[PDB]
């Protein structure tokens, strides 16, 4: 009784007229399926394939998003943490100044925090502004008899902009601290952006191919069994593992997906390990008090040579915890694409009393074919589909173009060089 399909099709929601009791005899399904049912069942067959794959790898999209939101929130907090800590130490020792000149540190980090969150891309002039704002106020402390009305309404570019080769008031501290601050803001940024792509990459990469060549005769896999015979013959592994590979042999991100998690860990280690953050959290205060000491004993040369013109939330999780917590989440992601076919053929299919044989392309006959191929050279011997001459598809092949430059952008940033 083909009406066994009728109730099963009623669960899927078909208008059960002209399908219950009648069977007659770039295409599909060589049957108790009507003409318009076929054209509408392949569309129904494709739907689960998308929803199954996207839900299968859905946790990579959520993990990279969760680590992003918790790493991005971490860096912003430690910027605000160090801003408040630098004010405490400098107010204790010196009761002569800084009593009402802590307003510069607010404008210092705020422009630093714009380089981190891409709000701006100007840091070399940003630091020169800060050193100048300190330069035009410490300078008169050892020159108290003199008073200075600045030139025009702005002293200069930013008073002694050091351009054109001024004998630096703070000798080497501006260059040294710039090198230490620059390597930090760019390393913590290429890491966050790298995670930001990873979410976007896998999110759109999970949107599954339409591949009409794969879609047509995909119905043969699981759909057309319902059309002719009873639906109790859920397909076994042999047939399944090749149609899901042949339809997905394009998205072979495996060569470019491995180096990505490598660069994520490599940059994380240099960033987790000191010299990239917690050192430059206190290095600012050390070099500032060191540069002023150079000034104190080298002001005789510079001041004499400058007679001319004007002269509540939960505290940031420890980065070490945030790194091995990051490391564990990523361990289950490296060999993900190779293990993707097993999960897809390991859900609705009970392959894991009745029998072992299952449905095949043209009957219930026994199957013993091969089923490992995963790239164009490997899937050129495709028994059940027609993979493209070069496996990678036109939009995907553009996900190994702008979505692996971050790896080199994270690797180079881990060295100190950027752009």
């Amino acid at each position, epitope marked *: 009784s083909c009406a066994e399909t009728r109730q099963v099709l009623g669960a899927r929601g078909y208008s059960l007229n002209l399908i219950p009791p009648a069977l007659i005899t770039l295409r599909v399904c060589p049957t108790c399926c009507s003409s318009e049912t076929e054209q509408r069942l392949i569309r129904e067959t494709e739907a689960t394939f998308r929803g199954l794959v996207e839900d299968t790898g859905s*946790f*990579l999209v959520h*993990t990279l998003a*969760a680590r992003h939101r918790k790493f991005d929130e971490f860096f912003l907090e430690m910027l605000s943490v160090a801003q408040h800590s630098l004010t405490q130490l400098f107010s204790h020792s010196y009761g002569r100044l800084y009593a009402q000149h802590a307003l510069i540190f607010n404008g210092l980090f705020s422009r630093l925090r714009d380089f981190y969150g891409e709000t701006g891309e100007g840091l070399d002039d940003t630091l020169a502004d800060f050193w100048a704002q300190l330069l035009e106020r410490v300078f008169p402390l050892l020159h108290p008899q003199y008073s200075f009305p600045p030139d025009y309404l702005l002293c200069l570019s930013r008073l002694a902009s050091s351009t054109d080769g001024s004998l630096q008031p703070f000798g080497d501290s501006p260059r040294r601290l710039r090198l230490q601050i620059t390597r930090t803001l760019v390393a913590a940024r290429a890491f966050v952006q790298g995670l930001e792509t990873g979410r976007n990459v896998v999110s759109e990469a999970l949107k599954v191919p339409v591949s009409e060549g794969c879609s047509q005769a995909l119905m043969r896999l699981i759909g057309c069994p319902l059309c002719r015979g009873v639906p109790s013959l859920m397909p076994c592994q042999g047939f399944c593992l090749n149609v899901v590979r042949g339809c997905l042999s394009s998205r072979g991100l495996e060569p470019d997906w491995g180096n990505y998690l490598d660069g994520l860990l490599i940059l994380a280690d240099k960033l987790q390990g000191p010299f990239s953050f917690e050192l430059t959290a206190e290095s600012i205060g050390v070099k500032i008090s060191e540069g002023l000491m150079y000034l104190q004993e080298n002001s005789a040369k510079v001041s004499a040579q400058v007679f001319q013109e004007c002269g509540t939330t*939960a505290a940031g999780t420890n980065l070490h915890r945030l790194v091995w917590e990051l490391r*564990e989440r990523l361990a*289950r992601m490296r060999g993900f694409w190779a293990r993707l076919s097993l999960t897809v053929c390991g*859900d609705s299919r009970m392959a894991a009393l009745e029998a072992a044989p299952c449905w095949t392309g043209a009957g219930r006959g026994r199957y013993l074919p091969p089923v490992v191929g995963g790239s164009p050279a490997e899937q050129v011997n495709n028994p059940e589909l027609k993979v493209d001459a070069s496996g990678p598809d036109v939009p995907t092949r553009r996900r190994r173009l702008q979505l692996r430059a971050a790896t080199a952008r994270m690797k180079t940033a881990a060295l100190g060089h950027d752009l």
Partner: antibody, heavy 119, light 108 residues
Framework: EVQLVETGGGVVKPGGSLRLSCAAS????????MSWIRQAPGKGLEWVSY????????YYADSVKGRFTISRDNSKNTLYLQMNSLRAEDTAVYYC????????????WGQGTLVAVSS | DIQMTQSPSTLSAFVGDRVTITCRAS??????LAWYQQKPGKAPKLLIY???TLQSGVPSRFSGSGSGTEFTLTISSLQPEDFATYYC?????????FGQGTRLEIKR
């Protein structure tokens, strides 16, 4: 489809030991983070433990730090929980859940099986 | 060591009304907040995670918007199968804490 079935007795006196199994099917057990959340006869839900997918990181609540132990079996696809020397306060309905990927969200919960401590 | 709160404890509303459930936390939580629905004596469902994002299968009538220490959960048009107990969660600290449920009953 995605199924989390729990088993284990629930009627023991103070000092008795119970172990619960959270048999999982419908998805690869090795990818996701698992956890245990209990619901007392009261309204609120209390968190007790959680374990990494590989099993490398284990967390216990402050009220279950010494006498509680959680394990894992990615081959059999089963989540366990060792309940030892439970006090009367441990009386609750114990669920097992799966972390969808985002930190501490539980999209799929178990049917529930209750543990009772009484003399 | 972290406290979660909800309001109100019990809200009476008709089928087809607009319902807003407010959750309040002790300390700041940027976007780490989850919502759950629990019918009597059965397993809870995941409604809204990450403050504002909906879970697959949850209808469009469920909405949640919050940033900081004040959060809400909105039902645009109440359908008869929405009468249950709704729970708040935390996704930041090591001791994750739920808020006591808000019971949504039928008005009569």
């Amino acid at each position: 489809e995605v199924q989390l079935v729990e088993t284990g007795g629930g009627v023991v006196k103070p000092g008795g030991s119970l172990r619960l199994s959270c048999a999982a099917s419908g998805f690869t057990f090795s990818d996701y983070y698992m956890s245990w959340i209990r619901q007392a006869p009261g309204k609120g839900l209390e968190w007790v433990s959680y374990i990494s997918s590989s099993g490398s990181t284990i967390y216990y609540a402050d009220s279950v730090k010494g006498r509680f132990t959680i394990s894992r079996d990615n081959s059999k696809n089963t989540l366990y929980l060792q309940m030892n020397s439970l006090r009367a306060e441990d009386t609750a309905v114990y669920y097992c859940a799966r972390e969808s990927g985002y930190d501490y969200v539980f999209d799929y919960w178990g049917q529930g099986t209750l543990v009772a401590v009484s003399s | 060591d972290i406290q979660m709160t909800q309001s109100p404890s019990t809200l009476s509303a008709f089928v087809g009304d607009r319902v807003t459930i407010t959750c309040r936390a002790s300390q700041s939580i940027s976007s780490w907040l989850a919502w759950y629905q629990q019918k009597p004596g059965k397993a809870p469902k995941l409604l809204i995670y990450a403050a504002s994002t909906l879970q697959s299968g949850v209808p469009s009538r469920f909405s949640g918007s919050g940033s900081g220490t004040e959060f809400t959960l909105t039902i645009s048009s109440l359908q008869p199968e929405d009468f249950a107990t709704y729970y708040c969660q935390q996704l930041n600290s090591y001791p994750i804490t739920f808020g006591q449920g808000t019971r949504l009953e039928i008005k009569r």
